[PDB]
Design a protein around this ligand. Structure first.
Ligand SMILES: [Ca+2]
Length: 579
DNA sequence: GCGATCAGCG
DNA sequence: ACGCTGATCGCA
């Protein structure tokens, strides 16, 4: 019902300087995934191409990598990475519908063209599930069905750029798309394609150690419990702890006894079995997620893993890492921190460089809340986490153990993000009256922060949404709900999203200024990972001197707040040695 | 499929 | 009864 040409060859009218391009990659993980079809819509008409034909034509390949040939797409990173696995570059992406919908409303959950088209009353295009099917029924259709679906998606992108750019401009989000998210999309594509090398031999050795350590801990659990049970079974573990051993019931989930880590920590004076169960899970978490799971996704010929950086998923504008997740690699426990030793540079005589912001959200909060004392604290380069560990535990700066500091990290972010005296009393294991007094003293030192959190909830109730420093937006319809639980979670989202989202916008602008700077200096250094507030790079060891002077200044100068930004950097032979 | 749990980021 | 994620696993 839509006219298009099924082009056998590549012609000149298909190579206009403005076009809507669709490079379809049906598989979820687009790394090394087959391209099933190509569709182009421009001023001259609508065209469908077969990938074996076009991707071997020199004029079509030159048209893809020509930055002066502007292309409108949906999810340009998916196509760009799949083309990189085919030796083909893709430049000139002037509009990405996927990221344009993500800025307008992040909760819409837009994952295909049809969902984004519905936001603008465009429905002349089928959802991808209706074309390819669900799960075990997933199948690329017959060429006439596939060719029309790809052309209808291209025609939809062709018609939706203008109305999407109009609403972005009213939301003050148009420069957020064109100057931040779309340039970031190209950088993330190179990071995903570059991959991160893994020492498969060392990981395989840890797995054999964890295999025989897990049995020893598992046998002591059976010794202390007096019988065998599925340690991962909540029913039997609940029977062992709160029926057999008759331990106190401190928490009940919707399904039964709660055996979470915070609960088992409080049962430590009562029995020695809860401390080994804790150790068993930690060894089990490392074994399943980071040993077996990591070796599953490694590419054997290159010993590199290729993550997918999801740019249009989080509600605050953060990134996320999938298959594998390289943003929750262990670090706090020494047994699990060794796994970071397996992450190595991709070439000999290369090293890993890693820089990160120091308490970025509290500094963003100081700027936005305009609090006198909080801005003074960071103008002195104070360590609020250590300074809070002194006030809590009555110790001095010398006696602040990294455990007392990480616990003060929770109090600092918890208090500013609406923790109650109940929740504070459970984390500090203090009386509920002391925790309430501590929160009163905390807001006496920072009255402007308390004033800001009241204003940001009142502004959310008025506007219906909250914004970040670069005008990223999150709607909060529940902020006016009649239910107390539903409204309170919305109020704490209004306190947190502008702060966490403004930190995401700063690290994103830093990535863009970093690659433009690395290009100017003509360095072979390139980014590998982003962990929210940390940037990880690899580079030849000779470039390390320049990077120690370049990366900190680039990150510190990404934005200009009423307080300075601080960046700490390290380099070394592995990711482990890079912090 | 989902909830409990836990790894990370603030 | 601070916020934002992804992976694993048992299933009450
Ligand atoms: Ca940090």
């Amino acid at each position: 019902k839509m006219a298009f040409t099924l082009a056998d060859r590549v012609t000149e009218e298909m190579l206009a300087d403005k076009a809507a391009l669709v490079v379809e990659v049906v598989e979820e993980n687009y790394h090394d995934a087959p391209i099933v079809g190509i569709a182009v819509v421009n001023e001259h008409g609508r065209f469908f191409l077969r990938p074996e034909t076009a991707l071997a034509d020199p004029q079509f390949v030159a048209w893809l990598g020509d930055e002066t040939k502007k292309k409108s797409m949906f999810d340009s990173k998916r196509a760009a990475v799949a083309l990189k696995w085919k030796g083909i570059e893709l430049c000139g992406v002037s509009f990405d519908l996927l990221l344009a919908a993500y800025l307008l409303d992040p909760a819409q959950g837009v994952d295909d063209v049809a969902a984004a088209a519905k936001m603008k009353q465009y429905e002349a295009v089928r959802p991808d599930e209706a074309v390819y099917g669900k799960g075990a029924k997933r199948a690329v259709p017959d060429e006439p069905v596939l060719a029309e679906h790809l052309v209808r998606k291209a025609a939809a992108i062709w018609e939706l750029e203008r109305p999407f750019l109009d609403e972005l401009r009213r939301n003050e989000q148009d420069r957020l798309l064109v100057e931040l998210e779309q340039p970031l999309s190209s950088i993330l594509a190179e990071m995903e394609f570059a991959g991160v090398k893994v020492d498969t031999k060392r990981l395989e050795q840890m797995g054999k150690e964890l295999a025989e350590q897990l049995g020893t801990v598992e046998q002591r659990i059976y010794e202390l419990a007096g019988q065998e049970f599925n340690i991962n079974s909540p029913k039997q573990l609940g029977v062992i702890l709160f029926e057999k051993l008759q331990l106190p019931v401190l928490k009940k989930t919707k399904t039964g006894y709660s055996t979470s880590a915070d609960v088992l920590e409080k049962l430590a004076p009562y029995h020695e079995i809860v401390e080994n169960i804790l150790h068993y899970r930690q060894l089990g978490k490392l074994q399943s997620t980071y040993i077996e799971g990591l070796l599953k996704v490694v590419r054997p010929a290159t010993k590199k893993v290729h993550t997918i950086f999801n740019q249009a998923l989080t509600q605050t504008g953060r990134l996320s890492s999938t298959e594998p997740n390289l943003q929750n690699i262990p670090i706090r426990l020494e047994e699990g921190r060794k796994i970071r030793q397996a992450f190595v540079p991709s070439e000999s005589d290369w090293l890993i460089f890693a820089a990160d912001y120091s308490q970025i959200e509290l500094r963003v909060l100081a700027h936005i809340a305009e609090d006198d004392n909080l801005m003074e604290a960071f103008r002195r380069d104070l360590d609020i986490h250590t300074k809070t560990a002194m006030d809590i535990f009555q110790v001095s700066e010398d006696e602040v153990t990294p455990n007392m500091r990480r616990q003060a990290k929770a109090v600092n972010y918890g208090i500013v993000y609406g923790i109650s005296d109940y929740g504070l009393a459970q984390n500090l294991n203090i009386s509920r009256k002391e925790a309430a007094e501590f929160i009163e003293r905390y807001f006496e030192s920072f009255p402007g922060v308390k004033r800001y959190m009241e204003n940001i909830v009142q502004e959310a109730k008025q506007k219906g949404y909250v914004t970040t420093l670069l005008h990223r937006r999150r709607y909060l319809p529940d902020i006016t709900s009649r239910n107390f639980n539903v409204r309170s979670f919305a109020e704490r989202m209004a306190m947190n999203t502008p702060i966490q989202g403004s930190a995401a916008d700063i690290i994103k602008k830093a990535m863009i200024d970093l690659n433009a700077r690395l290009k100017e200096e003509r360095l072979q250094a390139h980014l590998l990972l982003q962990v929210h507030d940390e940037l990880i790079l690899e580079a030849p060891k000779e470039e390390m001197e320049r990077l120690c002077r370049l990366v900190p200044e680039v990150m510190e100068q990404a934005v200009t707040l009423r307080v300075p930004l601080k960046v700490d950097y390290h380099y070394g032979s592995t990711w482990y040695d890079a912090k």
